[PDB]
Amino acid sequence: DKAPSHVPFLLIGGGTAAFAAARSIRARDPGARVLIVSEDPELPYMRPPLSKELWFSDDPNVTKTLRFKQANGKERSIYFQPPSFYVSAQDLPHIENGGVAVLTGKKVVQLDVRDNMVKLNDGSQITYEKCLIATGGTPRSLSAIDRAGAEVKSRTTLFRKIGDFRSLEKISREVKSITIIGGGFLGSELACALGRKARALGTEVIQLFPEKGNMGKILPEYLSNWTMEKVRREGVKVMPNAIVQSVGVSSGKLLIKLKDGRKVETDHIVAAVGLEPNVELAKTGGLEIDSDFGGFRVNAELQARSNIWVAGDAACFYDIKLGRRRVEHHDHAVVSGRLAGENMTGAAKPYWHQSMFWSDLGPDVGYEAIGLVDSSLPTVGVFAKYGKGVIFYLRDKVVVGIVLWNIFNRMPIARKIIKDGEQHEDLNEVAKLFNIHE
Amino acid sequence: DKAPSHVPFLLIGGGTAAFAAARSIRARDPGARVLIVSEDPELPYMRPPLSKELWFSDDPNVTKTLRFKQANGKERSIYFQPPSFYVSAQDLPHIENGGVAVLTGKKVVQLDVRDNMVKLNDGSQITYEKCLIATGGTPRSLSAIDRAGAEVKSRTTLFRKIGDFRSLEKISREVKSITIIGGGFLGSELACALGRKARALGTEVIQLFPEKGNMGKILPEYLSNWTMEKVRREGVKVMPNAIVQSVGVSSGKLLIKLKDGRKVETDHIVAAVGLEPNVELAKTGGLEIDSDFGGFRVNAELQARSNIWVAGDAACFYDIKLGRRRVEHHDHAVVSGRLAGENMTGAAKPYWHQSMFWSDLGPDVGYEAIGLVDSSLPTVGVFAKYGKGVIFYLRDKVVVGIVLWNIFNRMPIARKIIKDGEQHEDLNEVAKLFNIHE
Ligand SMILES: Cc1cc2nc3c(=O)[nH]c(=O)nc-3n(C[C@H](O)[C@H](O)[C@H](O)COP(=O)(O)OP(=O)(O)OC[C@H]3O[C@@H](n4cnc5c(N)ncnc54)[C@H](O)[C@@H]3O)c2cc1C
Ligand SMILES: Cc1cc2nc3c(=O)[nH]c(=O)nc-3n(C[C@H](O)[C@H](O)[C@H](O)COP(=O)(O)OP(=O)(O)OC[C@H]3O[C@@H](n4cnc5c(N)ncnc54)[C@H](O)[C@@H]3O)c2cc1C
């Protein structure tokens, strides 16, 4: 309840990276006292289920329980730990053997790097010995929607939190037409999710984006096209090559006008058009932000200053093997958050273990990716029963990124390929490492 | 001298930044053991005298003694400390209360960050606890000269080291014409030095550069032009707007041909056209280079990795007040080197004290500078008795750089102006702080 005046380990933001760092610290410093300061009233929880498993649950009380069944059939909660796992912030300095506390509903509004101090929105001040910035990011919006009136904004969801899942799940049961703007994995996952729900009600789900196919920036054109067909088969009207010119309300309906002259009538909009790193604290903290990738600029060890690290979506870090990056993946927040916790306890380790990404777009599509995955890089695809396959992303004749298409339990192989940096003469032989033959 | 297997503090490079760090480390830890590895045969020495005082010495043995009198008339050596200040590398781990050693004539060729180890050109391996990279930079040459024959290269000086001063000084007494290429402070300082020698000796000194006038990139056009006139008054033939097309030999002499119709014939060429940061070790070390400014990319505390720092000309650092920069100034090497040393002894403080710059172009021109000094920025100059004046460099209606023209003992005032960063209603009133009125 009441924030202590001083804490050894202070973690800013109560998300995935923060929780991984808290567990990492406690593992290496058993009696450590870690304080997470989270503006969100919720305790740390994982987000991937918010766009997937929580929508495919048979339990009608899922919106209340926030529980789901994993791939192996085991049921669990999206929260990393139950409330009993944590200690209260007030008892954190006094409790024997320390623990992990979460100060929910409180925002760090000022970072005093000189005096190792943070100021909260309620005027409280907390001094620290080692600080992790794990603020993640805010979902971006459209300028066309920003310029629109207040009703348009109130009928637009920026999907990221538990509150967005509950509000949107209720909307899906109240309106007849939901439009998703954005072709990325998130927008495509929400389209498949709302798509399955729409079938029970006979409602409409629309997805439009500027690219020529789903994940146009990520997957090569041919696979992006195939994926778009699978999204359509999930009960989605996909409108590629769509750039939003303006948005307004006409007779109660939302009217989306595209630059190509087309117009779309809908009841509600979901905007999935990228993430904005939360770097407000860089101003008072005098911390550097990366102008190319956004976010806090940190080195290979995720360190910004003597006792300040950054992990998760907010951390623009230097990859020794792949260059400066900023990754927005669940496993990355775990890996980078875990790494930060180790470095905050003297590990002095650099980012080395490459984190992975995954996405599920209906039952027939499951993606796993790792490394530099971008459609503008040269690509070589090897497939077998359309069906499954691997896509290698090349730079300087070396594989720097891999996308696995309906191939599971083989990420270590992909990680080793990127690691060794070997110049392969025939990627067909390399595809056999992923059980792709013929 | 032989290198130990281990040393607590390892400084790569034996220049100004390295010495300032060694002095700083020892000041903080009077028992520290510091090893400087220098590819140069010389002990650490300051460079500004190589283009100024050493050429105006009243001692005809200056080229051998390398001693000179400062502005206050106090004689001293170009070396930071005499050999008695240092100990041998072999005895460094065994001498009680440690000391500072300089491994001369050895080049670190490999940096193994993982194992905190370096490899020398002779195969020796040295492990460290904390490491500073102070490798400075190599003088840049001209493509036109790179294309010329070996004889042309043999008669071109890349002025930077003690050997270049001795070689060029010997030449000035053996040839009839020397040509300096480059309009910066270095080229201009050398022009004034050789020009004075040419006065009471009967020889020619030529300076040519593509800019409209000396320090075209630094000073405003009107002040650059005024400075060019006084360099000429020192006995120099200044040829602005000169772009070299080729360099060849003609009857034993060097014939420079500019892109325009002009042609210059001289006996010797001195090239002073910028510096190339020495970042060879970034490859094996897995260290990040700055593609914009060059050099190693470090944070505000001059840190690159957990136990690696960078200082001096080779350090691209984050200036909390002015942004990311890389400065190539003597005082910067001292300030950043000693700040590095402090941070290598647990200080953990950012670059906050702004370093200054100076240049002497004859007896009637004394420049001092601080902050972001760039002719492409908007400037406001205030002058009194042409005489003296101050040049304010503005960004966002705030002073970010100051050049003082024949105004001394007032750098703390210029530093304070840049520190406060307040929008001034009238810069004339600010100029009064520098004793400029009417
Ligand atoms: C709906 C959804 C589905 C996803 N699905 C997948 C998937 O299938 N696969 C995959 O690999 N990745 C997926 N991701 C990405 C993954 O969830 C993110 O990379 C991960 O959540 C990043 O965690 P984080 O801790 O870095 O940031 P966050 O989880 O955003 O944590 C930051 C927290 O700090 C708080 N905060 C911010 N500023 C302050 C402040 N000043 N003071 C206090 N608190 C502050 C924020 O409110 C927030 O609660 C998904 C993301 C979303 C949103
Ligand atoms: C002639 C001259 C005049 C100048 N006059 C002025 C002036 O009036 N005012 C001013 O402000 N600045 C002046 N400067 C600039 C100032 O001298 C520099 O900013 C300063 O020398 C930078 O010091 P440093 O230690 O960073 O680099 P350096 O002095 O270049 O030190 C680097 C050293 O490390 C060595 N080294 C490099 N790589 C390795 C390796 N792998 N292993 C081992 N050793 C290595 C190099 O050989 C060199 O000896 C002048 C410079 C010159 C050359």
Curated annotation (Swiss-Prot), chains A, B:
There is a cross-link at K130 (Glycyl lysine isopeptide (Lys-Gly) (interchain with G-Cter in ubiquitin)). Changing G235R: In DFNX5; uncertain significance. One of its GO terms (cellular component) is mitochondrial inner membrane. Changing W352A: Disrupts dimerization. This is Apoptosis-inducing factor 1, mitochondrial. Expressed in all tested tissues. Detected in muscle and skin fibroblasts (at protein level). Expressed in osteoblasts (at protein level). The chain holds residues 126 to 612 of 613 of the full protein. It comes from Homo sapiens (Human). The modification Phosphoserine is found at S143, S167, S246.
